[model samples]
Target chain A: GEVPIGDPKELNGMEIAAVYLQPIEMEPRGIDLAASLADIHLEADIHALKNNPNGFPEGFWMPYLTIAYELKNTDTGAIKRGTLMPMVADDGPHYGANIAMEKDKKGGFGVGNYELTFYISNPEKQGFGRHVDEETGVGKWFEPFKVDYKFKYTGTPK
Target chain B: GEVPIGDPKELNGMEIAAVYLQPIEMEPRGIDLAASLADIHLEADIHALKNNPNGFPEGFWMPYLTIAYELKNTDTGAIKRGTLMPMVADDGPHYGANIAMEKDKKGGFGVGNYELTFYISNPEKQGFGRHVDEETGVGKWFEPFKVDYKFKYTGTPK
Candidate 1:
């Protein structure tokens, strides 16, 4: 029931299906007092695995990527980075600018055996209008990359 | 850490904070064969309970509801209903729906004690705006309601 954290990767043609969950409570609007706003909720279920890079939006699951990341905790080798926002749901679109673990870096909530690195940029350079549309603005993108992932995260947190 | 899942309620003024984890596999592609498409992932951490119906947006944490539910399973009482979309992220805007407990007409996913029933409709009858633009929606939407929750779900997809 546990054996999934990598195996849906393809950059350039864009097809991600990353996962790392457990650690919930994302309460926004003034943090603190104890609740949640981050830490473990990076599900990169991006799409368009193979052609169909049209204007997007007839069944568009949302395409406006500019994710970033880097994390290492191979048991205290310690490292962390961020930049993963972009979220929308009903069960679609993904990213997770979520990860707040500080108890001395590899401390609490920062499980272990991690080494997740990804950095996909060039969302029309954030001009978004992805695949632009003057007539689907000649679809083309996926020229920024970096990928690698591994896991052993015994996700914790109520 | 398991001290979440029910403890932050307030209808009308709206302030939810429901939970139910352990079941992650949400694969949204054609058909699926072995890999999540649903089952356990329902976080309702909506906001604005005191007052601030200001037309949402700008430090805004989304507000466009019409949530519905009915999950029951007191051992085998079995029940399941739907409707609970509305999502957004960058670390906020919630509803987090991804449920799929099967038992046919009587609901299940193993383990027990559940009875989460919430249905808070009325967001201008879900038209959301042709241009209701008070700046754009959200001044009030908490008339059609119902709330009652119970927890103890040893969620499983294992």
Candidate 2:
């Protein structure tokens, strides 16, 4: 269960608002890979977004890719990714919705502390960011500027 | 628990009508011939008695030793070695006392079929049979007799 984030606030010149997101991708990261190989490897280069100290709740973890992200803000709403959003549901969406008004790492559903990020549109791609790489020509980076912005908003269980 | 023996007829008359009887015994039976024990044998044997094959209840057997002439039934009321007498309690002497009566075997209160042997005796010596072997040394015998008996009776749980 999750609490509501009531009342949006203007943070860093951007009206920051938080949104409760659910995955449309049945498979979040990818198919389970390590699941096949019981042989484990020793790697120290792991980020908080990808792997936590403890594995994770049974099904909460995406099989392939870890739930790591960087929160990017936009003109309309903020984009959350990479170790920004906090805990959602105990049992997760599979069992029930996280509608209980409770404070977690992602800030409560009601008015609470939130670390939001902002993003700006790239002119060359019109609403898309451009990117130039050695191999792939010039391309717009979907959302250009990412600012640390945060606001509170109320939410209900769907 | 088992019910008391109700009908005396259920018992074999030859067992109770014997003149001389001895409790079953175990021995290494054979002529004890010096150090060269040629017939080295160990057995529990039943020498003589009013043989009653179907003598006991479901899970039971009884073996005894007796003088060759003890079972002589000269008198009409002369009792056999394995005879079933009336079982008396504070309730009074009961006729046709069933050996499987709940009050007789006392249900499972008695030891299991593998253990616990009760002596068959004219307890009051009314039939000229002494309860104590020391009283007359008349009931003892060298013939080893093995007795095994079992029965089921119904009664209220403790």
Candidate 3:
């Protein structure tokens, strides 16, 4: 659950405005990989065109945005992936998802580097930046952008 | 959420008739230790005295059962513990609780053997096997038992 981005002025008409992983310690800088379970909270700042006249209660509106995430063990070349559709349900007004992974596994995290990548795309194939209106059934959109973000995790302890 | 032990035939004027860890794998004979997360599902067979005119609207009534779990590293003699009150709320009529743990950590499950212990008790201090009536202020009684169960995990590979 997330709060709507106030200051609609910041909407700026950009489709996929911004995205980041929390505990940003797992960003450019990483963390000592442990054999424990940890939750990585990911949030994407999605920019909507305007208020929806046919949205739930006729207020908030969102582009049909699809988000895919991947965690790669750089040393072992192992990968784990998952996808989430932000505006698909009433789970939230704001877009945030969580990925739970155990740092320790049968193959082992293996003391080295791990990488995280986020692929943000509009999978509806509704043409760039445009989406089918839930009410009018018309193509309405903003500026479309497909982007990839990378984060890092360092496995340590010699 | 849990399912009530619905068969009245099994209801013989007992508070808690039977309780045990499922999968029999996590029973007296345990699971092989892997560097991953394992979920232990605990189920308790709870019974209530028949035909209580004041037994919670013919619906919601649960025994006050508390569950405590401990993970011990037999090699290092280290222990990790947690407590859960499964039947405390109105979530379910049956008794089932989950305990998730990873076999690796800072304290380390290190490649060896580990032990798991489950402690189940009705700690309302409601006197042995005795439960107080919420409506009539009467002590509706049954047999009470405090039990400890043990399971094992062996971590291998160097």
Candidate 4:
């Protein structure tokens, strides 16, 4: 869920900014990446752009969205997939995930061509709903959608 | 921002379960753990329990809150501080963060005693609020508060 290489791109009225880094440490107990030798952090910072498609305030982060990610190392046709957590930091709230790798895996995070896709859905799908006031005031949630990115893990970790 | 070691505990009508794991990888660009040689993943899973103090539904994740964490290594008197982000996992939505460590400093993630504290505040302070349709909705947000836990990090990474 980490995006850092490019400017924010707007898709279907949602503006997403993504980045990747030399994977840092994680709490293994939460997601269990014990099998891997290293991790690559992929984070996506999302905001509401034009269409007001999901009732999120324009420029506001679409809160509590359940998201997933898939990364393909086009160099060897090796793919990786996992859930992305919507987490907050000093800057603001956004998405984050660890892309695990093993020495035995296709060139564990080698510098090469890659294809990244974000699988996103609303919290309602996760059995979560907003607490509206009397009479209930809410709008239609966004259906499941995916956005694709053809980027390179070409840059050095900053 | 992660929890795992013990059962959930109720605090001020809010249920908080906290845990720490052998640090996992992180997105250096997002929070920058370069100074440290390792990271310990700390997470806190929160739920609405009795007294309904914050108006959150019982057993539901209290969403969109701004929370911070401060950790003190009792063995060496070293202190680390950072903000915590609300995040989601396959299990559900909760909080997650990386506790960075440096070899030159105290024994990074050394098996010993530690004191943990969560500094939590409402999203309104972060300029976030509900889109309550046409009228003003929502209830009184929780004031800034702190929760403390003295625990031991004496186990191997499971």
DockQ, all models:
0.02, 0.00, 0.01, 0.02
List candidate 2 segments past 4 Å from native: A1-18, A22-25, A28-113, A118-144, B1-158
lDDT against the true structure, per candidate, is 0.52, 0.22, 0.36, 0.59
Candidate 1 clashing pairs? A84-A97, A87-B89, B25-B36, B27-B36
Cα lDDT for residue B51, model 4?
A: 45
Ranking 2 against 3 by DockQ, winner: 3
Report the Cα lDDT for residue A102, model 1.
48
Clashes of 3: 0
The 10-residue segment of model 1 chain B with minimum total lDDT is B128-137
TM-score, chain A only, candidate 4, equals: 0.75
DockQ of the two-chain complex in candidate 4:
0.02
TM-score of candidate 2 to 2 decimals: 0.17
Q: Residue B89 lDDT in model 4?
A: 36
Give fnat, all candidates. 0.00, 0.00, 0.00, 0.00
TM-score for each candidate, following the candidate numbering = 0.24, 0.17, 0.27, 0.46
lDDT of 1 by residue, B109-158 (tens): 55678888777775445433211112212343446777778888765433
For model 4, how does the per-residue alpha-carbon lDDT over B1-158 read when each residue is reduced to its tens digit? 33355455676547877886544333223452331344455678777675454344465566667778887878888787887665433244456665654432655446667888888886556443321111212234567888888887764442
Assess the local accuracy of residue A22 in candidate 4 as a C-alpha lDDT between 0 and 100.
50
The clash numbers for all candidates, in the given order, read 4, 80, 0, 29
